[PDB]
Amino acid sequence: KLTIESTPFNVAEGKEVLLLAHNLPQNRIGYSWYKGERVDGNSLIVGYVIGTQQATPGPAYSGRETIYPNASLLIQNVTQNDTGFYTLQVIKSDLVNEEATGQFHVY
Amino acid sequence: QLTIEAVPSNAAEGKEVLLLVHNLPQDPRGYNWYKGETVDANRRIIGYVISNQQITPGPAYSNRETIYPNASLLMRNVTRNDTGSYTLQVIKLNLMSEEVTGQFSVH
Ligand SMILES: [Cl-]
């Protein structure tokens, strides 16, 4: 089952956090990361097409996020407003998509 | 503007409801329907992949639902327990998405 691990969980203001996706589906074709606990267009950080490596920012994009081909999301120079839940949707070739939510906490 | 129109909006038990989709984006790749107000794989009713016309029953499929190539969802044999919200996610060719939620009631 797709799960998100934040490392570290407790992240000092100004430092960075890496959100790792474990158990990716084999027929993955893209990713979308969202701020909060749900898929929601108003909270899209970044979308990503694996094959072209094309990242597309959304309204929650800060310029401090980087999405990697294994779906990991690095957030740099974190602030108190970055604190909380992040949700990954993995888009698959059959569109039987999967989601997982992770969390970190800025201190 | 992507919208759902429930036909009818308030249905009698045993009858049917069609969730008619208006204003699909250009370059859809396919669709998924969800029970409730949020995209959630566990609540996925059924989907459709345009390129190979693949229909994808999900965990919330109840043997009453049909998805049409225009993304509309037909539910046959409705009951009072179907009353509530239903959410469509459209995946575009570039793997960006749009979500919209409609509702209907059964008396
Ligand atoms: Cl780290």
Q: CATH no. for residue A44? A: 2.60.40.10
Put the strands of the sheet holding A44-49 in their side by side order: A10-11, A98-106, A84-92, A28-35, A44-49, A54-57
Q: How many structural domains compose chain A?
A: 1
Yes or no: say if B87 and B21 are a contact pair by the CB < 8 Å rule.
no
Contacts of B1 in chain A (CB under 8 A): none
Q: Which residue range(s) make up the domain with A19?
A: 1-107
Cα(A78) to ligand 1 centroid in Å equals 12
- Rounded to whole angstroms, how far apart are CA atoms B107 and A100? 36
- Rounded to whole angstroms, how far apart are CA atoms A15 and A11? 7
Please check whether residue A91 touches B, CB under 8 A: yes
Rounded to 5 degrees, φ, ψ at A71 are 80, 0
Yes or no: say if A11 and A17 are a contact pair by the CB < 8 Å rule.
yes
Q: Is the dihedral of CA A30, A15, A62, A82 positive or negative?
A: positive
- Rounded to whole angstroms, how far apart are CA atoms B3 and B20? 8
- Rounded to whole angstroms, how far apart are CA atoms B94 and B59? 26
Please check whether residue A53 touches B, CB under 8 A: no
Q: Which chain A residue shows the shortest CA-CA distance from B33?
A: A96
User: Strand pairing of A98-106 and A84-92?
Assistant: antiparallel
User: What is the least distance, in Å, from the CA of A68 to any CA of chain B?
Assistant: 16
- Rounded to whole angstroms, how far apart are CA atoms A62 and B37? 27
Homologous superfamily (CATH) for B1-107? Immunoglobulins (2.60.40.10)
Q: Look up residue A103 and give its two tokens.
A: 């969390």
Contact between B44 and A49 using a beta-carbon 8 Å cutoff: no
Resolution of this model in Å is 1.9
The closest of A15, A26, A34 to B39, measured between CA atoms, is A34
